[PDB]
Structure formats: C-alpha cells, structure tokens
Amino acid sequence: MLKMEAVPLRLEHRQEVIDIIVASFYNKADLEQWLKPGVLRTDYSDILNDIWNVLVERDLSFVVYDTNTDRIIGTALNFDARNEPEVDIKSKLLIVFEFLEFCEGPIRDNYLPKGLNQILHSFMMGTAEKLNPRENIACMHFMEHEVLRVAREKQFAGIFTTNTSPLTQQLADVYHYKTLLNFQVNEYVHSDGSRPFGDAPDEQRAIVHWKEV
C-alpha cells in the first residue's frame, strides 16, 4: 500500500516539481493538445521558474513523498487567488491561461469572497510519471485531502480550481466541490476570433470548482 507524506514546498524542490509538472502536462493536458504544434516542455518550466521563489515564499504549496522510497510522487501548487504573481507568458500557454481566466475571472471577482486569504487557488497539480493507476488515484486522493487541510489551517474560506481533465473533474465532484462553471472548451473564442480548442469534442469541458472549507 502506498504510504505518503505531504511536505511544504522548499526552494530545493524546484527541479523535482518541474519534472512532475512537465511529465503531468506535456503531451497530456487536454487543452494544450489542441494548440499543437509549438507547445514545448520548457513552456511549463519557464512558468514555474519565473514564480518559483514567490511560490515557496507564500507557503501554500507542498510536495508528496512516497515515505517508502523517500521520493516525490506528486505536488499541489496553490496561491491565494487574489495574491498571485504576474507572469508574462510567451508560449501558446498564454491562450490556456487567458482561457482559464475567462472561466475563473467573472466568477471569482463577482461571486467569491473579497479580500486576501479567502480563496485558495489550487492552480496546478501533478503526479510522477511512473505511478500506476492505483498509485496515481491514491496520490490524487491524498493531495485533495491535504489541500483542504492547508486551506483550513491557513484560514482560507474555500478552495478554487478549474479542472480540465475528466479525472480531476470527476474527483472534484466526489469531493463535493460545487460546479460554478461547466464551459465547453471548443466554444472559447481567442482575441483573434479563432477557437483555439475548436477541434475538441463537445464533451471536453473546463469546469470551475469551488468548495467552502
């Protein structure tokens, strides 16, 4: 049985966290797959490197250790939704983040609690590539359990996230997140009038999720 431990993010975790995020998102993320070609592994590391110091400083994120191997198998990256660093994104990932803001912005700024230390933004989550289904689902359960604990211990009002894969969307549902938006990603229009995810099937959703703690 997989034995796990959540450890706050430290500065030295940078490459391990990058490895896990890159392996979790590159060629696997449901949104970026429609922006091919030209989405590179470094587009993810470039973002993480730019925010890494603030990400550790804010003390809201953590890594998950397999305590039997003492290696990192997962990570949950969190910010105060109203106190996030500003990243100038150069890659096609800017479209992903502008879409996510399209999903989150209206709801966050008009329906969720105002002020700092209210909205724990679970903005990135990843698990190690070598995890089998039983290790991955359990790491996902464990990080969900720990994100809630961080939210309560840090006195946030709730956990805010946009889930873009069927598994994370279904996980959020059985964890009793409320759906605040279920957007059909192939209907999103870019600033140039194109639908960057237009080739996606109608069934691919972006779901904004929110759970009061």
Ligand X SMILES: NCCC(=O)NCCc1ccc(O)c(O)c1
Please, which residue, 26 or 65, has the CB nearer to Ca ion?
65
Do residues 185 and 130 make contact, with C-beta atoms less than 8 angstroms apart?
no
What is the total count of residues that contact Ca ion (CB under 5 A)? 1
What 8-state DSSP symbol labels residue 118?
Answer: S
The helix-helix angle for 14-25 and 41-58 (nearest 10°) equals 130
Question: CB under 5 to 8 A by kind: which of Ca ion, ligand X, none does 65 bind?
Answer: Ca ion
16 binds Ca ion (CB under 5 A): no
Min separation Cβ 206 and ligand X, Å: 9
CA distance linking residue 180 with residue 155, whole number of Å: 22
Site for Ca ion in 54-73 (CB under 5 A): 65
Please, which residue, 10 or 178, has the CB nearer to Ca ion?
10
Question: CB under 5 to 8 A by kind: which of Ca ion, ligand X, none does 156 bind?
Answer: none
Please, which residue, 73 or 120, has the CB nearer to Ca ion?
73
How many CB atoms are closer than 10 A to CB 87?
Answer: 15
Residue 63, CB half-sphere, CA atoms under 13 Å: how many? 23
> CA separation (Å) from 140 to 2, 4, 125, 194, 202?
12, 11, 9, 34, 26
Question: CB under 5 to 8 A by kind: which of Ca ion, ligand X, none does 150 bind?
Answer: none
Please, which residue, 96 or 150, has the CB nearer to ligand X?
96
Min separation Cβ 44 and Ca ion, Å: 25
Give the binding site for Ca ion (CB under 5 A).
65
